[PDB]
Amino acid sequence: SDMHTELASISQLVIAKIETIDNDILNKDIVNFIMCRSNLDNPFISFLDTVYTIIDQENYQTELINSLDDNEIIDCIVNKFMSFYKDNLENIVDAIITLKYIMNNPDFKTTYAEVLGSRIADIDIKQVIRENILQLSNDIRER
Amino acid sequence: SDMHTELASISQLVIAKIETIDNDILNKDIVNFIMCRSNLDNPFISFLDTVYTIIDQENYQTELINSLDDNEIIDCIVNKFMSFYKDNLENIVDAIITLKYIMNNPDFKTTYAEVLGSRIADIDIKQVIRENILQLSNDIRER
Numbered sequence: 326s327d328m329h330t331e332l333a334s335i336s337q338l339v340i341a342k343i344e345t346i347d348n349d350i351l352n353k354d355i356v357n358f359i360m361c362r363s364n365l366d367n368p369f370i371s372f373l374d375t376v377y378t379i380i381d382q383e384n385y386q387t388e389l390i391n392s393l394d395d396n397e398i399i400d401c402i403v404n405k406f407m408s409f410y411k412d413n414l415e416n417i418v419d420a421i422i423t424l425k426y427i428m429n430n431p432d433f434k435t436t437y438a439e440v441l442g443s444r445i446a447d448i449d450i451k452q453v454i455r456e457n458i459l460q461l462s463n464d465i466r467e468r
Numbered sequence: 469s470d471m472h473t474e475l476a477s478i479s480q481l482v483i484a485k486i487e488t489i490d491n492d493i494l495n496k497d498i499v500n501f502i503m504c505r506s507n508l509d510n511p512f513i514s515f516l517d518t519v520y521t522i523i524d525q526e527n528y529q530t531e532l533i534n535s536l537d538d539n540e541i542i543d544c545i546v547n548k549f550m551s552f553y554k555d556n557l558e559n560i561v562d563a564i565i566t567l568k569y570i571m572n573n574p575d576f577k578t579t580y581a582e583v584l585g586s587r588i589a590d591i592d593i594k595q596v597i598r599e600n601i602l603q604l605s606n607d608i609r610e611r
Contacts, residue, residue, distance in 0.1 A: 400583045410553030
């Protein structure tokens with residue numbers, strides 16, 4: 326409801342600050358987010374967090390994941406992770422959130438935490454983020 | 469020894485024929501290769517196969533993999549697969565071969581065959597291949 330002015334305003338803050346941010350640090354903040362530790366100081370994280378919040382009215386993801394067996398998880402993981410090396414921001418964001426919802430599972434958390442850590446360390450998404458953030462903002466405000 | 473004239477000659481055939489090839493089919497041939505079914509009619513496969521052969525004098529990969537537990541495999545898989553969405557051909561080729569060596573493990577084969585199938589279906593590497601093949605040829609001839 327009030328999340329309109331919210332999201333647009335943070336977008337604007339993101340694009341303004343993205344370049345300046347070291348990528349290694351960005352990737353650390355992102356991991357942390359997946360692990361349910363949101364450093365809101367980082368605007369993009371703040372962006373993510375807001376978005377998550379909106380989605381978790383749905384809540385469906387949690388139930389979904391709790392059903393998945395291991396092959397399904399692995400498929401999910403590998404499928405989602407590809408977003409990062411491609412150039413669609415929506416799917417990147419979606420991926421990240423999907424990954425948090427996974428790490429909210431205590432079993433999957435234990436198993437796959439480490440690797441997510443390792444593999445996120447190797448992505449580079451600053452371009453995608455500056456280039457798409459404001460458009461994404463709208464796609465969702467309106468969604 | 470005679471693999472010099474071999475590899476250079478097939479490279480040349482690859483670049484000549486790559487564009488023409490439908491990507492969905494290419495990806496099918498590649499999967500099949502990972503599963504130890506080399507359609508040599510496809511020049512790139514032939515390329516792969518040759519390369520594999522060279523490497524399997526080493527043979528080390530097999531022993532290596534047989535040691536890996538599941539997290540390690542998963543890490544390997546996800547790490548390697550990223551090559552596909554990036555633009556280094558060497559690492560792509562290396563990845564593919566690494567994946568075959570995995571599918572030579574009967575246990576890992578059973579578990580992960582399906583997903584490799586699914587996920588390879590979504591890559592697109594024709595650009596990378598035309599743009600790099602001849603250079604790669606040399607890097608290896610000389611290696």
